[PDB]
From a paper:
Here, by using X-ray crystallography we studied the structure of yeast [name]-RRM and showed that it corresponds to the canonical RNA recognition motif. The structure is composed of four β-strands and two α-helices which are arranged in a β-α-β-β-α-β sequential order.
Crystals of the shorter truncation (rsidues 76–161) diffracted to 2.6 Å. Comparison of the relative orientation of the monomers between [name]-RRM76–170 and [name]-RRM76–161 showed that chain B in [name]-RRM76–161 has been displaced by ∼9 Å relative to the same chain in [name]-RRM76–170. Therefore this dimer is most probably an artifact of the crystallization and not the functional unit of the protein in the solution. This is in agreement with the gel-filtration profile of the protein showing that it eluted from the column at a volume corresponding to the size of about 10 kDa (data not shown).
Numbering used by the authors: 72 to 161
Write the structure that this text describes.
């Protein structure tokens, strides 16, 4: 019912306003889905500025799904200014 080690932390992700999260979320999900199974993605928001904190959390539904995403996306360039870094959230 409940899984373990399926949560992963992502760093180096675009810091954008809240209204632009839906688009980015769908884009990142489509990307990560290529390598692993994605269940839910969260974009923590900074109350002070109304923008994302730059990092996010990804629930993959299973352990090996989270590890295949980390292995495939860690240290990769999302774009010019952004380079993603992933690791399992203990």
């Amino acid at each position: 019912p409940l899984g373990s080690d399926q949560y992963i932390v992502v760093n180096g992700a675009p810091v954008i306003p809240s209204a632009k999260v839906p688009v980015l979320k769908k884009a990142l999900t489509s990307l990560f889905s290529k390598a692993g199974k994605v269940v839910n993605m969260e974009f923590p928001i900074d109350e002070a500025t109304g923008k994302t904190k730059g990092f996010l959390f990804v629930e993959c539904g299973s352990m090996n799904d989270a590890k295949k995403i980390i292995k495939s996306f860690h240290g990769k360039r999302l774009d010019l200014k952004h380079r993603l870094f992933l690791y399992t959230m203990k």
